Amino acid sequence: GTFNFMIVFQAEHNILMHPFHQLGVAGVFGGALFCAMHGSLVTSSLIRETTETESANYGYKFGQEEETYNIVAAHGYFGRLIFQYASFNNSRSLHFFLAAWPVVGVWFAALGISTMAFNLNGFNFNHSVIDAKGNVINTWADIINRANLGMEVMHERNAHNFPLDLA
Amino acid sequence: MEVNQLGLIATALFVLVPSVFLIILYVQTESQQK
C-alpha cells in the first residue's frame, strides 16, 4: 500500500522532479553515507585494548572517562583522504553535522509531501525542448512523463467519470 | 490461498536453525566461570 501511495504520488505530482524530494534523497543517501563513514573512521581509530582472540568491543568499558578512539588519527586519515580542511578535527562540530544533514534533508522531504499536498508539484519540462520548426524534442523529462502517464491512466481504474483528476 | 506448500517448513527452519545456534552459544556462554 506504501508502494501504491508512492506510485500514485509520482503520477500526480511528479515528486521525483521536485527539489524538496531531491533534498530528501540527498538527506537519506547522505545520512547513510555519513553514518557508514563515521562508523568506519571511529572503528578505524580504536585504541588497542584487546587481543586478537577477543572482540575489540571489550576494549571499551561503559562509562569510562577516556575516549575509546583516537580522533586525531581519524582526522589525520580522512584529512589526507580528501584534504585537511575537508575533515573535522572537532568532534562536536562533526556530530552536529551528523545530526543536521539527515534531519534537515528529511524536513525538506516532509515539506515536499506537505506542499505537493496543495499541488505545487515537481518541475514540468514536458515539451520544453523544441526544434526550429516546432517539432518536440524529447528529453529524459518526457520519458518520465510517459511513465507518469501510464500511472495516471491506470490508477483507480473505476474511480473517474470525468477527464481530469483534479484532486 | 494457493501458497507454496513448502513455505511453512522453509520459514520455520529459517527461523529455528540460526535462532537455535544463537541460543546454544549464549547459554554455553552464561555457564562459563565468572
Partner: protein
C-alpha cells in the same frame, strides 16, 4: 600545514588578481565563443534546433546497427538535405 602557500594569502594578494582578472574572463569568453560560434555543435555532433528532423520527418534517427552505426548517422545527417 603541508608546505603550500595558504589559499587566503594567495587570493587576498594583488598579484593573484592581476593574473586572474585576465585569465578568468579570458576562459569565460573562450567558452562563450565556443558556443556562440557554433563550434560546440560541430565538435560534439549535437543537432542545432533546425537539424533534429527533416522538414516533413517525424521519425527519430535511431541507430539500429552496431558496426555500420557510423554510416547510419552519416546517412541521417545527409537526409537533412
Amino acid at each position: 600545514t603541508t608546505g603550500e602557500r595558504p589559499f587566503s594569502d594567495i587570493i587576498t594578494s594583488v598579484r593573484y588578481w592581476v593574473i586572474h582578472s585576465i585569465t578568468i574572463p579570458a576562459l569565460f569568453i573562450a567558452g562563450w565563443l565556443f558556443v556562440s560560434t557554433g563550434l560546440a555543435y560541430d565538435v560534439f555532433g549535437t543537432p542545432r534546433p533546425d537539424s533534429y528532423y527533416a522538414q516533413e520527418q517525424r521519425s527519430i534517427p535511431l541507430v539500429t546497427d552496431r558496426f555500420e552505426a557510423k554510416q547510419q548517422v552519416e546517412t541521417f545527417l545527409e537526409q537533412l538535405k
